[PDB]
RNA sequence: ACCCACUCGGCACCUUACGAGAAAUCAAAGUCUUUGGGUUCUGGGGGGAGUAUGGUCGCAAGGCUGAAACUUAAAGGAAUUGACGGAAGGGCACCACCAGGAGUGGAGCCUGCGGCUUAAUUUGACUCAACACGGGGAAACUCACCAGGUCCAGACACAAUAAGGAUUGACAGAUUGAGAGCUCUUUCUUGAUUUUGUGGGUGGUGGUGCAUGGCCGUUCUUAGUUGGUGGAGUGAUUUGUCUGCUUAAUUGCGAUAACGAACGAGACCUUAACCUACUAAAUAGUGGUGCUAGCAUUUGCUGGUUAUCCACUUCUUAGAGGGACUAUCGGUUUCAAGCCGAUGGAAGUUUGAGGCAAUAACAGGUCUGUGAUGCCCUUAGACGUUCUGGGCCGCACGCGCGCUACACUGACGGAGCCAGCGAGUCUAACCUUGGCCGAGAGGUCUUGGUAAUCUUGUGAAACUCCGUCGUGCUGGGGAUAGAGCAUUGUAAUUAUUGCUCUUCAACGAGGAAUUCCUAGUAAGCGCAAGUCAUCAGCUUGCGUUGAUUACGUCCCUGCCCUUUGUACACACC
RNA sequence: GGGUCGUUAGCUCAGUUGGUAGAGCAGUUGACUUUUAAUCAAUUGGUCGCAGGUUCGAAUCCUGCACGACCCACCA
RNA sequence: AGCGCCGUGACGCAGUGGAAGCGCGCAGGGCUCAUAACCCUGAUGUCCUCGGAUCGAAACCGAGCGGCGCUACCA
RNA sequence: AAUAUGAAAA
């Protein structure tokens, strides 16, 4: 076949393997008490408070119930 | 050899686009034609649609109709009929 | 002059090979590695070259004598098997012709190829032996091409990263054709499966069909091909495998330094023709009797009705078998194989058509069928896989299969209206009956059928019968365009296809050329299957109607055998 | 010696009056074939032999020179 | 220096005031395995350029261009 | 009766 040449400049750069959140201890800051909850935790049965809901536009999202899970509280 | 030049193949484009009295039968009768038919079909030992068309200049269709009316008036005698040709005589007592 | 025998000397000849020879051949070309009767001349690879030069003869043309430089690996001789011949002999083929038929090539369109074009117009194939071919009738898929975007299904080993996390997925906004997080923003999710790298595999409708298997075609639809042991020859090789006659046949009868065999042909197998026979048959029928309908009115005729039953297998399906073996007769030839005519017979061309089909080969076609593969390339901004949209159809032209016609042997309308091969769904949706609705396509509600049971008697067309016509580019042809109506399909647009109305061009029997064809054959006429979701002008089959002319030839193109010539052997290109 | 004419791709030939280089051969590449040859397609190479007038600007117009090609060069 | 001539398809050459012909060559198509030849067809011409005259010219007459030929004798 | 030619190696 012909020698291949790309019209687009560059496209190999993938998303990173991970966000690199290091220790990921964003659970809560507490002074030797019961540390408790920083974010809320999902009410859906498929999670059962196993997940911290996200925040992208001041509304929250579940990465385990996943996709269109939307709360605005 | 076999492959011609592109200019020679342009002669495909240069090819360019260059490449290698009715009869007036009656079709409608008049008094004169009407007189003509009953005076002459006593002749014409053989009468059919084509013969009437050839020797009386009738437009074929009216030749067929005239044959039916010649049959109705009995001046004609059948030998055979068909949806595409009919054979007729002068109602001759000679044969 | 003959005849018979002999002799001497010639011109030769016939048979053999003791002998000679590389062989063809030779009574000399013998008496030759067992090499010596006498003597003259000539040659040392082929060309250069009988050239130059020097002589010499000649009126001249030229004759005699006669080099070298240089150049080259063969040149050449005799036989062998082929190939080939405008060589001969024999027998043959509608891929040959004759006598013809139908056509093509002339026009329009479908379709394939080339050329051109383009981002791509994917590609293999180019005399028979490529071009309605790759089962290739491509809207997405197919697809291999083009413009773009994903994904990895990169096995496994090791090294690195590394659960105070390897890695994965993310709604939404941007971006993108795109509810592809692909990538960016964002914070969540997942948790040893991975990721990165070194190796190493895996895929490829990527290249090579000239590196291969397999498959097919072709040589090659003709009758050809091979061993054993003998015979000839130093040997390649030859005979067997052939003079004649015959057969479709290397088929036989015969001949015979060959005998006996093997593949091929044949024999064979399937299908198509006869079966009042065996076996039968609510998935085929028929008749009779019941019940019923109509006319007759009737006694007879034509129908409907399987739980009305009974009988039967003629037609229909079959299983096993019979039959054909040129049977018999008359002619004709080693008088054999065989052939010709007639008789009978369902059939007397191998009874018809196919299947299978040998030795050897092509540098035929295919790695785009193959998880069959060698080698090369590539392997993650892959030539892998997949998604969106084009393309395979693009049009100045050339070519090849064809489908329409150019009309009265018709066109049209209304009747009669009769086949065969075959195919079809069930847990998935086929073949569809009947009813209803709509001009139509089609829509609608059900029905039978896993099928001799229902589609389906596939009630096909051509055909016939009765009417409109009119000799006219006309009601022939319906290409070409518009508008509209449905179907298949996620999607039709570069109109899938069907229908309605309108448009109505070329086409006047086709130039040089050229294809096919000997009887249910050509041809006309459609039907089924194939591919298929829809679509046929395509092929594979089937049936309806159904000719003319042959019954021969080697004149063109070719084939097989024998003889022959050859300076050909990648073989008359 | 004078008058005239012409010199452009590696080569050859057109050009054209004042807007810019065309054709063939050659060379490179690809197609083609087993590979070449041939053929085809594309590309390369051209300050137009050196100094002017301006048609804005010359390859072509014009004056020089360096090549060359022609024509003419006492006299009785 | 003077005078005369020619110029027409790619090539050679015709041809008259109503407009372009011949042969060759080219092109298609067939035959051929392919080429040649052969068979059936087809095209292609600012008639050197410009202007004028004419109803219209290749032709007529001017301009130009290119290519030719003749004259060049008496001393 | 006319019927010429078919590149180089393999």
């Amino acid at each position: 076949r012909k020698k291949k040449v790309y019209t687009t400049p560059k496209k190999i750069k993938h998303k990173h393997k991970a966000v690199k959140l290091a220790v990921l201890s964003y659970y809560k800051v507490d002074a030797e008490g019961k540390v408790t909850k920083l974010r809320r935790e999902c009410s859906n049965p498929t999670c059962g408070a196993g997940v911290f809901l996200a925040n992208h536009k001041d509304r929250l999202y579940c990465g385990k119930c996943h996709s269109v899970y939307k709360v605005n509280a | 050899l076999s492959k011609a030049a592109k200019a020679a193949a342009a002669l495909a484009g240069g090819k360019k686009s260059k490449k290698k009295d009715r009869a007036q039968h009656a079709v409608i009768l008049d008094q004169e034609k009407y007189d003509r038919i009953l005076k002459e079909v006593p002749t014409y030992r053989y009468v059919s649609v084509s013969v009437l068309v050839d020797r009386l200049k009738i437009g074929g269709s009216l030749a067929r109709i005239a044959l039916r009316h010649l049959e109705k008036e009995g001046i004609i005698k059948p030998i055979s009929k068909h949806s595409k040709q009919a054979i007729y005589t002068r109602a001759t007592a000679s044969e």
Side-chain angles (χ1 to χ4, degrees), chain A residues 1 4-6 8-10 12-14 16 18-19 21-73, chain B:
Chain A
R1 314 197 197 196
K4 194 43 62 203
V5 159
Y6 297 102
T8 50
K10 206 30 177 163
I12 80 175
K13 214 192 311 293
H14 275 176
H16 51 46
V19 194
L21 297 176
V23 73
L24 165 141
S25 69
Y26 53 85
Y27 205 142
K28 208 83 191 49
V29 197
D30 195 6
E32 315 314 310
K34 257 101 193 185
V35 152
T36 326
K37 306 339 305 284
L38 183 59
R39 285 327 182 292
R40 20 186 312 177
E41 289 212 295
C42 183
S43 58
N44 183 283
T46 61
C47 292
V51 300
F52 258 33
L53 315 82
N55 170 29
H56 315 98
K57 304 76 183 163
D58 294 344
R59 75 318 182 264
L60 293 91
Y61 152 89
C62 168
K64 183 55 171 68
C65 280
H66 202 351
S67 294
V68 295
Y69 178 90
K70 280 278 138 281
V71 307
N72 304 77
Chain B
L1 285 175
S2 186
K3 284 220 71 51
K6 189 135 93 74
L11 291 203
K15 166 60 192 47
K16 195 52 151 193
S17 58
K18 41 201 197 336
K19 208 173 190 184
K20 183 184 173 294
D21 181 21
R22 171 206 191 123
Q24 210 34 27
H25 298 52
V27 199
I28 176 56
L29 281 53
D30 53 39
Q31 176 57 299
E32 312 290 40
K33 290 228 159 81
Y34 216 123
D35 303 343
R36 274 220 50 210
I37 171 170
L38 304 318
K39 77 159 70 54
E40 292 146 342
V41 201
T43 80
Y44 316 143
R45 151 205 302 287
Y46 156 55
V47 164
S48 74
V49 46
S50 37
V51 156
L52 300 174
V53 171
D54 275 338
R55 197 191 333 189
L56 314 168
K57 323 296 143 186
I58 306 182
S61 35
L62 295 208
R64 269 187 283 112
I65 288 158
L67 258 197
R68 324 211 181 261
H69 283 77
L70 290 166
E71 202 69 314
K72 165 206 61 151
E73 311 146 10
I75 181 58
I76 307 300
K77 159 182 80 189
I79 313 89
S80 183
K81 296 178 179 177
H82 180 260
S83 45
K84 299 188 179 192
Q85 164 204 80
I87 305 98
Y88 281 139
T89 320
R90 325 170 270 190
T92 50
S94 49
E95 286 103 299

